Design an enzyme around this catalytic site. Structure first.
Site, PDB file in Angstrom:
ATOM      1  N   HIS A  86       0.822  -1.201   0.000  1.00  0.00           N
ATOM      2  CA  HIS A  86       0.000   0.000   0.000  1.00  0.00           C
ATOM      3  C   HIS A  86       0.863   1.260   0.000  1.00  0.00           C
ATOM      4  N   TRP A 156       7.252   0.689   4.115  1.00  0.00           N
ATOM      5  CA  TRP A 156       7.590   1.312   2.837  1.00  0.00           C
ATOM      6  C   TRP A 156       8.977   1.951   2.842  1.00  0.00           C
ATOM      7  N   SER A 184      12.627   7.437 -13.382  1.00  0.00           N
ATOM      8  CA  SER A 184      11.500   8.120 -14.012  1.00  0.00           C
ATOM      9  C   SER A 184      11.341   9.540 -13.485  1.00  0.00           C
ATOM     10  N   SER A 185      11.468   9.714 -12.171  1.00  0.00           N
ATOM     11  CA  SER A 185      11.294  11.026 -11.570  1.00  0.00           C
ATOM     12  C   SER A 185      12.411  11.975 -11.980  1.00  0.00           C
ATOM     13  N   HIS A 268      11.862  13.048   3.761  1.00  0.00           N
ATOM     14  CA  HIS A 268      11.001  14.201   3.968  1.00  0.00           C
ATOM     15  C   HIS A 268      10.779  14.974   2.664  1.00  0.00           C
ATOM     16  N   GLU A 270      10.459  13.969  -0.180  1.00  0.00           N
ATOM     17  CA  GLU A 270       9.424  13.235  -0.895  1.00  0.00           C
ATOM     18  C   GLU A 270       8.029  13.817  -0.655  1.00  0.00           C
ATOM     19  N   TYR A 272       7.126  16.921   0.256  1.00  0.00           N
ATOM     20  CA  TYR A 272       6.976  18.232  -0.368  1.00  0.00           C
ATOM     21  C   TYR A 272       6.986  18.113  -1.881  1.00  0.00           C
ATOM     22  N   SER A 283      -4.072  26.981  -6.353  1.00  0.00           N
ATOM     23  CA  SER A 283      -4.003  28.403  -6.701  1.00  0.00           C
ATOM     24  C   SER A 283      -4.797  28.712  -7.974  1.00  0.00           C
ATOM     25  N   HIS A 317      13.326  14.582  12.109  1.00  0.00           N
ATOM     26  CA  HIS A 317      12.114  14.486  12.917  1.00  0.00           C
ATOM     27  C   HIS A 317      11.427  13.138  12.722  1.00  0.00           C
ATOM     28  N   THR A 343       4.103  27.910   4.843  1.00  0.00           N
ATOM     29  CA  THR A 343       2.846  27.225   4.554  1.00  0.00           C
ATOM     30  C   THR A 343       1.654  28.068   4.983  1.00  0.00           C
ATOM     31  N   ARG A 465       1.576   1.518  15.036  1.00  0.00           N
ATOM     32  CA  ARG A 465       1.565   1.276  13.601  1.00  0.00           C
ATOM     33  C   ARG A 465       1.940  -0.168  13.283  1.00  0.00           C
TER      34      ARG A 465
HETATM   35  C1  HEA Z   1       1.788  15.389   1.682  1.00  0.00           C
HETATM   36  C2  HEA Z   1       2.643  14.746   2.469  1.00  0.00           C
HETATM   37  C3  HEA Z   1       3.080  15.363   3.743  1.00  0.00           C
HETATM   38  C4  HEA Z   1       3.156  16.785   4.092  1.00  0.00           C
HETATM   39  C5  HEA Z   1       2.876  18.017   3.282  1.00  0.00           C
HETATM   40  C6  HEA Z   1       3.628  16.720   5.493  1.00  0.00           C
HETATM   41  C7  HEA Z   1       3.854  17.949   6.262  1.00  0.00           C
HETATM   42  C8  HEA Z   1       4.416  18.102   7.603  1.00  0.00           C
HETATM   43  N1  HEA Z   1       4.728  17.030   8.380  1.00  0.00           N
HETATM   44 FE1  HEA Z   1       4.480  15.004   7.910  1.00  0.00          FE
HETATM   45  N2  HEA Z   1       4.472  12.987   7.318  1.00  0.00           N
HETATM   46  C9  HEA Z   1       4.126  12.434   6.136  1.00  0.00           C
HETATM   47  C10 HEA Z   1       3.556  13.203   5.023  1.00  0.00           C
HETATM   48  C11 HEA Z   1       3.494  14.659   4.963  1.00  0.00           C
HETATM   49  N3  HEA Z   1       3.820  15.484   5.990  1.00  0.00           N
HETATM   50  C12 HEA Z   1       4.292  10.973   6.028  1.00  0.00           C
HETATM   51  C13 HEA Z   1       3.981  10.079   4.858  1.00  0.00           C
HETATM   52  C14 HEA Z   1       4.839  10.632   7.337  1.00  0.00           C
HETATM   53  C15 HEA Z   1       5.229   9.318   7.936  1.00  0.00           C
HETATM   54  C16 HEA Z   1       6.426   8.669   7.239  1.00  0.00           C
HETATM   55  C17 HEA Z   1       6.397   7.267   7.808  1.00  0.00           C
HETATM   56  O1  HEA Z   1       6.919   7.094   8.932  1.00  0.00           O
HETATM   57  O2  HEA Z   1       5.804   6.367   7.161  1.00  0.00           O
HETATM   58  C18 HEA Z   1       4.921  11.930   8.008  1.00  0.00           C
HETATM   59  C19 HEA Z   1       5.398  11.999   9.381  1.00  0.00           C
HETATM   60  C20 HEA Z   1       5.812  13.232  10.034  1.00  0.00           C
HETATM   61  C21 HEA Z   1       6.713  13.228  11.220  1.00  0.00           C
HETATM   62  C22 HEA Z   1       7.405  12.062  11.889  1.00  0.00           C
HETATM   63  C23 HEA Z   1       6.440  11.639  13.008  1.00  0.00           C
HETATM   64  C24 HEA Z   1       6.759  10.263  13.542  1.00  0.00           C
HETATM   65  O3  HEA Z   1       6.923   9.319  12.746  1.00  0.00           O
HETATM   66  O4  HEA Z   1       6.835  10.151  14.779  1.00  0.00           O
HETATM   67  C25 HEA Z   1       6.780  14.647  11.577  1.00  0.00           C
HETATM   68  C26 HEA Z   1       7.612  15.181  12.678  1.00  0.00           C
HETATM   69  O5  HEA Z   1       7.727  16.372  12.869  1.00  0.00           O
HETATM   70  C27 HEA Z   1       5.961  15.410  10.596  1.00  0.00           C
HETATM   71  C28 HEA Z   1       5.701  16.842  10.657  1.00  0.00           C
HETATM   72  C29 HEA Z   1       5.227  17.600   9.494  1.00  0.00           C
HETATM   73  C30 HEA Z   1       5.234  19.070   9.510  1.00  0.00           C
HETATM   74  C31 HEA Z   1       5.706  19.986  10.601  1.00  0.00           C
HETATM   75  C32 HEA Z   1       4.690  19.427   8.206  1.00  0.00           C
HETATM   76  C33 HEA Z   1       4.495  20.807   7.696  1.00  0.00           C
HETATM   77  O6  HEA Z   1       4.967  20.816   6.346  1.00  0.00           O
HETATM   78  C34 HEA Z   1       3.030  21.229   7.824  1.00  0.00           C
HETATM   79  C35 HEA Z   1       2.813  22.757   7.718  1.00  0.00           C
HETATM   80  C36 HEA Z   1       1.346  23.169   7.607  1.00  0.00           C
HETATM   81  C37 HEA Z   1       0.616  23.730   8.609  1.00  0.00           C
HETATM   82  C38 HEA Z   1       1.197  23.952   9.975  1.00  0.00           C
HETATM   83  C39 HEA Z   1      -0.841  24.104   8.395  1.00  0.00           C
HETATM   84  C40 HEA Z   1      -1.055  25.480   7.736  1.00  0.00           C
HETATM   85  C41 HEA Z   1      -0.398  26.627   8.498  1.00  0.00           C
HETATM   86  C42 HEA Z   1      -1.072  27.584   9.171  1.00  0.00           C
HETATM   87  C43 HEA Z   1      -2.582  27.604   9.191  1.00  0.00           C
HETATM   88  C44 HEA Z   1      -0.292  28.678   9.887  1.00  0.00           C
HETATM   89  C45 HEA Z   1      -0.468  28.702  11.405  1.00  0.00           C
HETATM   90  C46 HEA Z   1      -0.025  27.380  12.010  1.00  0.00           C
HETATM   91  C47 HEA Z   1       0.780  27.271  13.090  1.00  0.00           C
HETATM   92  C48 HEA Z   1       1.345  28.485  13.799  1.00  0.00           C
HETATM   93  C49 HEA Z   1       1.131  25.894  13.600  1.00  0.00           C
HETATM   94  N4  HEA Z   1       5.200  14.526   9.718  1.00  0.00           N
HETATM   95  C1  HEA Z   2      -0.810   9.257  -1.163  1.00  0.00           C
HETATM   96  C2  HEA Z   2      -0.570   8.465  -0.130  1.00  0.00           C
HETATM   97  C3  HEA Z   2      -1.627   7.667   0.540  1.00  0.00           C
HETATM   98  C4  HEA Z   2      -3.061   7.572   0.241  1.00  0.00           C
HETATM   99  C5  HEA Z   2      -3.888   8.290  -0.804  1.00  0.00           C
HETATM  100  C6  HEA Z   2      -3.497   6.600   1.269  1.00  0.00           C
HETATM  101  C7  HEA Z   2      -4.882   6.132   1.354  1.00  0.00           C
HETATM  102  C8  HEA Z   2      -5.467   5.231   2.356  1.00  0.00           C
HETATM  103  N1  HEA Z   2      -4.763   4.657   3.346  1.00  0.00           N
HETATM  104 FE1  HEA Z   2      -2.697   4.773   3.672  1.00  0.00          FE
HETATM  105  N2  HEA Z   2      -0.630   4.837   3.941  1.00  0.00           N
HETATM  106  C9  HEA Z   2       0.290   5.536   3.252  1.00  0.00           C
HETATM  107  C10 HEA Z   2      -0.069   6.492   2.211  1.00  0.00           C
HETATM  108  C11 HEA Z   2      -1.407   6.738   1.653  1.00  0.00           C
HETATM  109  N3  HEA Z   2      -2.518   6.112   2.073  1.00  0.00           N
HETATM  110  C12 HEA Z   2       1.693   5.316   3.672  1.00  0.00           C
HETATM  111  C13 HEA Z   2       2.945   5.940   3.138  1.00  0.00           C
HETATM  112  C14 HEA Z   2       1.545   4.353   4.761  1.00  0.00           C
HETATM  113  C15 HEA Z   2       2.569   3.714   5.642  1.00  0.00           C
HETATM  114  C16 HEA Z   2       2.865   2.294   5.162  1.00  0.00           C
HETATM  115  C17 HEA Z   2       3.852   1.741   6.178  1.00  0.00           C
HETATM  116  O1  HEA Z   2       3.506   1.715   7.390  1.00  0.00           O
HETATM  117  O2  HEA Z   2       4.966   1.384   5.769  1.00  0.00           O
HETATM  118  C18 HEA Z   2       0.103   4.137   4.822  1.00  0.00           C
HETATM  119  C19 HEA Z   2      -0.457   3.217   5.798  1.00  0.00           C
HETATM  120  C20 HEA Z   2      -1.875   3.101   6.092  1.00  0.00           C
HETATM  121  C21 HEA Z   2      -2.396   2.553   7.368  1.00  0.00           C
HETATM  122  C22 HEA Z   2      -1.642   2.099   8.584  1.00  0.00           C
HETATM  123  C23 HEA Z   2      -1.144   0.683   8.250  1.00  0.00           C
HETATM  124  C24 HEA Z   2      -0.469   0.115   9.487  1.00  0.00           C
HETATM  125  O3  HEA Z   2       0.151   0.891  10.252  1.00  0.00           O
HETATM  126  O4  HEA Z   2      -0.584  -1.105   9.711  1.00  0.00           O
HETATM  127  C25 HEA Z   2      -3.836   2.539   7.149  1.00  0.00           C
HETATM  128  C26 HEA Z   2      -4.829   2.111   8.145  1.00  0.00           C
HETATM  129  O5  HEA Z   2      -6.005   2.046   7.869  1.00  0.00           O
HETATM  130  C27 HEA Z   2      -4.105   3.110   5.817  1.00  0.00           C
HETATM  131  C28 HEA Z   2      -5.432   3.205   5.221  1.00  0.00           C
HETATM  132  C29 HEA Z   2      -5.701   4.004   4.036  1.00  0.00           C
HETATM  133  C30 HEA Z   2      -7.075   4.099   3.535  1.00  0.00           C
HETATM  134  C31 HEA Z   2      -8.293   3.454   4.131  1.00  0.00           C
HETATM  135  C32 HEA Z   2      -6.911   4.956   2.370  1.00  0.00           C
HETATM  136  C33 HEA Z   2      -7.920   5.424   1.411  1.00  0.00           C
HETATM  137  O6  HEA Z   2      -8.741   4.276   1.119  1.00  0.00           O
HETATM  138  C34 HEA Z   2      -8.707   6.607   1.915  1.00  0.00           C
HETATM  139  C35 HEA Z   2      -9.654   7.058   0.794  1.00  0.00           C
HETATM  140  C36 HEA Z   2      -8.967   7.559  -0.460  1.00  0.00           C
HETATM  141  C37 HEA Z   2      -9.532   7.335  -1.674  1.00  0.00           C
HETATM  142  C38 HEA Z   2     -10.825   6.571  -1.772  1.00  0.00           C
HETATM  143  C39 HEA Z   2      -8.960   7.830  -2.991  1.00  0.00           C
HETATM  144  C40 HEA Z   2      -7.473   8.096  -3.024  1.00  0.00           C
HETATM  145  C41 HEA Z   2      -7.109   8.729  -4.355  1.00  0.00           C
HETATM  146  C42 HEA Z   2      -5.942   8.492  -4.973  1.00  0.00           C
HETATM  147  C43 HEA Z   2      -4.926   7.572  -4.344  1.00  0.00           C
HETATM  148  C44 HEA Z   2      -5.636   9.172  -6.289  1.00  0.00           C
HETATM  149  C45 HEA Z   2      -5.612   8.177  -7.454  1.00  0.00           C
HETATM  150  C46 HEA Z   2      -5.036   8.877  -8.680  1.00  0.00           C
HETATM  151  C47 HEA Z   2      -5.830   9.451  -9.613  1.00  0.00           C
HETATM  152  C48 HEA Z   2      -7.332   9.458  -9.460  1.00  0.00           C
HETATM  153  C49 HEA Z   2      -5.221  10.133 -10.818  1.00  0.00           C
HETATM  154  N4  HEA Z   2      -2.890   3.347   5.062  1.00  0.00           N
HETATM  155 CU   LIG Z   3       9.262  14.639   7.418  1.00  0.00          CU
END
Ligand code: HEA
Ligand code: HEA
Ligand SMILES: [Cu+2]
Ligand SMILES: CCCCCCCCCCO[C@@H]1O[C@H](CO)[C@@H](O[C@H]2O[C@H](CO)[C@@H](O)[C@H](O)[C@H]2O)[C@H](O)[C@H]1O
Ligand SMILES: CCCCCCCCCCO[C@@H]1O[C@H](CO)[C@@H](O[C@H]2O[C@H](CO)[C@@H](O)[C@H](O)[C@H]2O)[C@H](O)[C@H]1O
Ligand SMILES: CCCCCCCCCCO[C@@H]1O[C@H](CO)[C@@H](O[C@H]2O[C@H](CO)[C@@H](O)[C@H](O)[C@H]2O)[C@H](O)[C@H]1O
Ligand SMILES: CCCCCCCCCCO[C@@H]1O[C@H](CO)[C@@H](O[C@H]2O[C@H](CO)[C@@H](O)[C@H](O)[C@H]2O)[C@H](O)[C@H]1O
Ligand SMILES: CCCCCCCCCCO[C@@H]1O[C@H](CO)[C@@H](O[C@H]2O[C@H](CO)[C@@H](O)[C@H](O)[C@H]2O)[C@H](O)[C@H]1O
Ligand SMILES: OC[C@H]1O[C@H](O[C@H]2[C@H](O)[C@@H](O)[C@@H](O)O[C@@H]2CO)[C@H](O)[C@@H](O)[C@@H]1O
Ligand SMILES: CCCCCCCCCCCCC
Ligand SMILES: CCCCCCCCCCCCC
Ligand SMILES: CCCCCCCCCCCCC
Ligand SMILES: CCCCCCCCCCCCC
Ligand SMILES: CCCCCCCCCCCCC
Ligand SMILES: CCCCCCCCCCCCC
Ligand SMILES: CCCCCCCCCCCCC
Ligand SMILES: CCCCCCCCCCCCC
Ligand SMILES: CCCCCCCCCCCCC
Ligand SMILES: CCCCCCCCCCCCC
Ligand SMILES: CCCCCCCCCCCCC
Ligand SMILES: CCCC[C@@H](O)[C@@H](O)CO
Ligand SMILES: CCCC[C@@H](O)[C@@H](O)CO
Ligand SMILES: [Ca+2]
Ligand SMILES: [Cu+2]
Ligand SMILES: [Cu+2]
Ligand SMILES: [Mg+2]
Lengths: 534, 256
Positions: A86, A156, A184-185, A268, A270, A272, A283, A317, A343, A465
């Site tokens: 997944h 993953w 590819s990327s 990380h 990845e 962004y 936008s 982090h 942000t 998890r």
């Molecule tokens: C689209 C993908 C995406 C994006 C954009 C982000 C964005 C951010 N993520 Fe996240 N993150 C993941 C996908 C993403 N993350 C995934 C996949 C994991 C788990 C990886 C794994 O272990 O599998 C993860 C896990 C992850 C961790 C590790 C946690 C752990 O495993 O214990 C942390 C730690 O700091 C983190 C923090 C953040 C922060 C600070 C942002 C910031 O960029 C967010 C900034 C945005 C806002 C804050 C909201 C808008 C702002 C305002 C409205 C202004 C006012 C707000 C304040 C003053 C707070 N995320």
């Molecule tokens: C883009 C990233 C992404 C998306 C879309 C999702 C979607 C969903 N994921 Fe997630 N998930 C991950 C990224 C994502 N996930 C990652 C990185 C992990 C960690 C794996 C690991 O632990 O190693 C994770 C793990 C994770 C867990 C924890 C597993 C565990 O710890 O054992 C669970 C639990 O329910 C979950 C459930 C779901 C469900 C129910 C949906 C969805 O069913 C929710 C509904 C969404 C939709 C119905 C549509 C989504 C649309 C698209 C994907 C776009 C398709 C493209 C086009 C249309 C052009 N996923």
């Molecule tokens: Cu990160």
């Protein structure tokens, strides 16, 4: 026929990426339905070791019907393989191919007035590497893997020594798949950057480039730095597994934590790379349906640059409990918090764009408004997680899972849907039925929040998890979350019906610009669909 | 002993605090939760108000402004100020968490696939702890009549399945416990939510954490780094007891 798959035109390649990313998305979403079937109730009822002794099609269909616990020997390896597949499919083979390979290839040349990309044959190769990587990822699921079963159950991000000791060659196939996705990327990024810099229309100054094209440009740069570092990390896994190196094996002087630094240096950035093109789409969509130019164009560009740069200095982090020094934990915490500032500028500028507009609540705008609210929900829990002293409790719990599904599945994915409804008329010459777009939106909005908001509660209650089964006290919110996932899946099947209906019998598009004059970028001056030579 | 450190049905908050570090986590999180809930409600209300106030049927001619210098300065400075306020309260908690005090009791913990090994170096005590219902107790990681009877006989109930182990890490209340954590094969992670501690068990590394339990009882954790097929099935039981009951437990282990 297959002359679709041989085309080098950026519009044709974009459409291949979009359809393929959607198909792989359906695969990975189907995995999550099965995951949430098993998590709906405590005790293991579906992933039974007894299903292994049947065939591969007998075992498959048996696996989809619940067994009594006394007839179900828990097969944790199947759980681990599903969530690994997944996550790998989503992070390498779905959302970035859709946003960057799909909308990026289709619309960035249009937005800058370029007839095609600098390297059209390289662009077509980029797509085939994506398909090859996807094929290897899927193949790994059926290859000899851990515990004498099929598939890699390693998460993953492939942490060693677990990843390097997993038996079979499934894990080697998964590493090659990721290699092919990185290639590819990188090819895509090289094409994006060259086209953006050299093939802009004369008279389109760089400060008249639309925000979506800016977002693709920044993203391409992040890819160029992040993906080679990932290629290094996973090649070291491959040699520890196969060529006698000991980079991550303590017996040979190696250090498993070293892998984590290198992986997360990619990992990380990845995320962004995922979200920046979604920012760009939001936008364009908000400006169009608020009937108002984007607020603060230059801050919008600089904020994306700042986010992309800051995205390279925060990686640990992901490692607060992995043995980091108190000095490292303090730095990475404060560096991470800074990202909230650029942000926030984009969130507030999107609201300021709507302020004083003349707002039309059509489907693309619904997705974009949902994005603003749900990405904020996910962003602020990210800020919670940046606090290492609170992350001590939340790390490797479902609170993290809730965080990243809000920013990805309720955020970047809302951007994808905003783009599809925004642009399907432009790409196909056929318009989606408006009531169905809105129903899709509300079903997804209700289902996805029901799926993931209760996972905060599970994480606060300490649910880890990557668990096939859980203590009885976690049953209530797991049941609610699984119901949300089933509703969301229905929403997605409905959406696929909407796309099928649209492309086969949707209302014919007659206008170059079927929205309004505030859709003011160059694709809206072309026919729907655009001419062959883009 | 009262079962304190465990999830509760339908729970939405943290597990109960049983340590000063856990209490600080609850305070820091609650403080941040009020902030981010305010921010989120504020953002949400602004969007909904804008949609209502500037819907095309209510505001037919859109404005065209794209700047507002006082507002843009304000919405950059106030976030920075909010973050500095959070960091000001959160860095002290972090330092208290990660600075290891002098130990009253030292336990060395080793994560294995799939169980934990405990060693009390001052006491020459060592033992392994398996999930009740694991193959070590004759099970196969699922509930069964035998497993529930084993849970009952060990002093638990069916509700503690996947949490309770055959042996427990026993420590005295109101004493500083320093735990040294390492992994034997792959990475595991040792944690107790009620104490606010979590530390990866990395092969080749010895990491430390500390807690001081402020009340007696039973406290559960679960392995928190994906380690393979029985990641879900190697939990942690800590029993916090009186100083005298702790000594009695030590004496029960003394070989004559
Ligand atoms: C689209 C993908 C995406 C994006 C954009 C982000 C964005 C951010 N993520 Fe996240 N993150 C993941 C996908 C993403 N993350 C995934 C996949 C994991 C788990 C990886 C794994 O272990 O599998 C993860 C896990 C992850 C961790 C590790 C946690 C752990 O495993 O214990 C942390 C730690 O700091 C983190 C923090 C953040 C922060 C600070 C942002 C910031 O960029 C967010 C900034 C945005 C806002 C804050 C909201 C808008 C702002 C305002 C409205 C202004 C006012 C707000 C304040 C003053 C707070 N995320
Ligand atoms: C883009 C990233 C992404 C998306 C879309 C999702 C979607 C969903 N994921 Fe997630 N998930 C991950 C990224 C994502 N996930 C990652 C990185 C992990 C960690 C794996 C690991 O632990 O190693 C994770 C793990 C994770 C867990 C924890 C597993 C565990 O710890 O054992 C669970 C639990 O329910 C979950 C459930 C779901 C469900 C129910 C949906 C969805 O069913 C929710 C509904 C969404 C939709 C119905 C549509 C989504 C649309 C698209 C994907 C776009 C398709 C493209 C086009 C249309 C052009 N996923
Ligand atoms: Cu990160
Ligand atoms: C949207 C497209 C796909 C949607 C798929 C929805 C699938 C729903 C499966 C039905 O529920 C499962 O099957 C049995 C009927 O509900 C129940 O048996 C169970 O009955 C008890 C329920 O408490 C358990 O304790 C037992 O272990 C177990 O065998 C069990 O609850 C549940 O796991
Ligand atoms: C948090 C997000 C909330 C967004 C708030 C939107 C800002 O409010 C508007 O900003 C304009 C500032 O740009 C002002 O127009 C002022 O400035 C314009 C020029 O930019 C003039 O054309 C107008 O006449 C003049 O009222 C206007 O009064 C003010 O209400
Ligand atoms: C989950 C999936 C995600 C949804 C993805 C959104 C769907 C994308 C739009 C479909 O693609 C377009 O369909 C048109 C079909 O009308 C084609 O027009 C073409 O039709 C003729 C051939 O059919 C060509 O000769 C012409 O160049 C051209 O007008 C066009 O090439 C093609 O790109
Ligand atoms: C895999 C699980 C999927 C579950 C999805 C559940 C599907 C529910 C279908 C509801 O029925 C539809 O309701 C619409 C109500 O709006 C009708 O549109 C009608 O109303 C629109 C809005 O006014 C008009 O544009 C149209 O002319 C008019 O067809 C539409 O025809 C009708 O079929
Ligand atoms: C699991 C699979 C899920 C399947 C998903 C299918 C989703 C796509 C359904 C679109 O439905 C169509 O929408 C049209 C509205 O756009 C309707 O036209 C109706 O409304 C038009 C617009 O008012 C009229 O001109 C038409 O004559 C009138 O039939 C039409 O009836 C209705 O069937
Ligand atoms: O909890 C109080 C905490 O205070 C001190 O830690 C300071 C440190 O001295 C400064 O360098 C600052 O930047 O970081 C910490 C913020 O409080 C004590 O040194 C520390 O032991 C104590 O726990
Ligand atoms: C048909 C592609 C969607 C796959 C559905 C996911 C369910 C997988 C069941 C696993 C059975 C193991 C043999
Ligand atoms: C009481 C006998 C079992 C009744 C529950 C059967 C539910 C099966 C759902 C299967 C769905 C597969 C997608
Ligand atoms: C021959 C061993 C594999 C070599 C891959 C690169 C190892 C060097 C570490 C680089 C770290 C990522 C850039
Ligand atoms: C190419 C970037 C690799 C990521 C940096 C690795 C840093 C290793 C730091 C080890 C710290 C030990 C105290
Ligand atoms: C978070 C997005 C919510 C946007 C509110 C939309 C209100 C829709 C009112 C109905 C308009 C005609 C169907
Ligand atoms: C084009 C007008 C259609 C009116 C809105 C249709 C969507 C209704 C919301 C349904 C919510 C169900 C979850
Ligand atoms: C803000 C999104 C909410 C999504 C619904 C989740 C249900 C929350 C209910 C909490 C109180 C239940 C007792
Ligand atoms: C206590 C037994 C619970 C079984 C309920 C199964 C619910 C399945 C709902 C599917 C909904 C799809 C939208
Ligand atoms: C204890 C919470 C009951 C379920 C609430 C559903 C929303
Ligand atoms: C703005 C998103 C925050 C998500 C956290 C939900 C926590 C719910 C708090 C319940 C605590 C009960 C004491
Ligand atoms: C375990 C008992 C401690 C409970 C902590 C509650 C603190 C709430 C903080 C609110 C701060 C608002 C500014
Ligand atoms: C804007 C980033 C805020 C930094 C903050 O966490 C700490 O520096 C406060 O001491
Ligand atoms: C409480 C009795 C102390 C017994 C002591 O000798 C042992 O813990 C050391 O082997
Ligand atoms: Ca189950
Ligand atoms: Cu483990
Ligand atoms: Cu584990
Ligand atoms: Mg971890």
């Amino acid at each position: 026929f297959t002359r679709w798959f041989m085309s080098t035109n950026h519009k044709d390649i974009g459409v291949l990426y979009l359809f393929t990313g959607g198909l792989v998305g359906l695969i990975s979403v189907a995995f999550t339905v099965y995951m949430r079937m098993e998590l709906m109730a405590p005790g293991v009822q579906f992933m039974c070791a007894e299903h292994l002794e049947s065939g591969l099609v007998k075992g498959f269909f048996q696996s989809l019907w619940p067994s009594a616990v006394e007839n179900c020997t828990p097969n944790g390896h199947l759980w681990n393989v599903m969530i690994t597949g997944h996550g790998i499919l989503m992070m390498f083979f779905v959302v970035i191919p859709a946003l960057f390979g799909g909308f990026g290839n289709y619309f960035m040349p249009l937005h800058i007035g370029a007839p095609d990309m600098a390297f059209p044959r390289m662009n077509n190769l980029s797509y085939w590497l994506y398909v090859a990587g996807t094929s290897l990822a899927v193949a790994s699921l059926f290859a000899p893997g851990g515990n004498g079963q099929l598939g890699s159950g390693i998460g993953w991000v492939l942490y060693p020594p677990l990843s390097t000791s997993e038996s079979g060659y499934s894990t080697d196939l998964a590493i090659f798949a990721v290699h092919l996705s990185g290639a590819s990327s990188i090819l895509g990024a090289i094409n994006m950057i060259t086209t953006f810099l050299n093939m802009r229309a004369p008279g389109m100054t760089m400060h008249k480039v639309p925000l979506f094209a800016w977002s693709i440009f920044v993203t391409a740069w992040l890819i160029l730095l992040a993906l080679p570092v990932l290629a290094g990390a996973i090649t070291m896994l491959l040699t520890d597994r196969n060529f006698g190196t000991t980079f991550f094996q303590p017996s040979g002087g190696g250090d498993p934590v070293l892998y984590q630094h290198i992986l997360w240096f990619f990992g990380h950035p990845e995320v962004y790379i995922i979200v920046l093109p979604a920012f760009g789409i939001v936008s364009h969509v908000i400006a169009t349906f608020a009937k108002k130019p984007i607020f603060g164009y230059l801050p919008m560009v600089y904020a994306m640059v700042a986010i992309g740069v800051l995205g390279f200095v925060v990686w640990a982090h992901h490692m607060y409990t992995a043995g980091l020094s108190l000095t490292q934990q303090s730095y990475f915490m404060m560096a991470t918090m800074v990202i909230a500032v650029p942000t926030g500028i984009k969130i507030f500028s999107w609201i300021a764009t709507m302020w004083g507009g003349s707002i039309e609540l059509k489907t693309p705008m619904l997705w974009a408004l949902g994005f603003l609210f749900l990405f904020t929900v996910g962003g602020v829990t990210g800020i919670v997680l940046s606090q290492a002293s609170v992350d001590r409790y939340y790390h490797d719990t479902y609170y993290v899972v809730a965080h990243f599904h809000y920013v990805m599945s309720l955020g970047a994915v809302f951007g994808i849907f905003a783009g599809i409804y925004f642009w399907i008329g432009k790409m196909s010459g056929r318009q989606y039925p408006e009531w169905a777009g809105k129903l899709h939106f509300w079903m997804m909005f209700v289902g996805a929040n029901l799926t993931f908001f209760p996972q905060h509660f599970l994480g606060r209650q300490g649910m880890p998890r990557r668990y096939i089964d859980y203590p009885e006290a976690f049953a209530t919110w797991n049941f609610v979350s699984s119901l949300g996932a089933f509703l969301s899946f229905a929403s997605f099947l409905f959406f696929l019906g909407v796309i099928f209906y649209t492309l086969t019998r949707g209302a014919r598009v007659t206008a170059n610009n079927y929205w309004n004059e505030h859709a003011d970028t160059l694709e809206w001056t072309l026919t729907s669909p655009p001419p062959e030579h883009t | 002993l009262e079962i304190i450190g465990r999830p509760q049905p339908g729970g939405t908050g943290f597990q109960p605090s049983a340590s000063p570090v856990a209490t600080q986590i609850h305070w820091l999180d609650g403080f941040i939760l009020v902030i981010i809930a305010a921010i989120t409600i504020f953002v949400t209300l602004l969007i909904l108000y804008a949609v209502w106030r500037f819907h095309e049927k209510r505001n037919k001619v859109p404005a065209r402004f794209t700047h507002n210098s006082p507002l843009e300065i304000a919405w950059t400075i106030v976030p920075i100020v909010i973050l500095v306020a959070i960091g000001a309260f959160s860095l002290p908690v972090l330092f208290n968490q990660q600075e290891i005090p002098e130990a009253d009791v030292t336990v060395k913990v080793t994560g294995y696939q799939w169980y934990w090994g405990y060693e009390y170096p001052d006491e020459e005590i060592s033992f392994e702890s398996y999930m009740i219902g694991s193959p070590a107790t004759g099970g196969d990681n699922r509930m069964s009549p035998e497993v529930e009877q084993q849970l009952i006989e060990a002093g638990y109930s069916r509700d503690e399945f996947l949490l309770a182990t055959d042996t427990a890490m026993v420590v005295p209340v109101n004493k500083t416990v320093v735990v040294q954590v390492t992994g034997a094969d792959v990475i595991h992670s040792w944690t107790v939510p009620a104490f606010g501690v979590k530390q990866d068990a990395v092969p080749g590394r010895l990491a430390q954490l500390w807690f001081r339990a402020e009340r007696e009882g039973i406290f559960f954790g679960q392995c928190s780094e994906l380690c393979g097929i029985s990641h879900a099935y190697m939990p942690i039981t800590v029993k916090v007891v009186s100083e005298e009951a702790y000594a009695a437990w030590l004496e029960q282990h003394h070989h004559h």
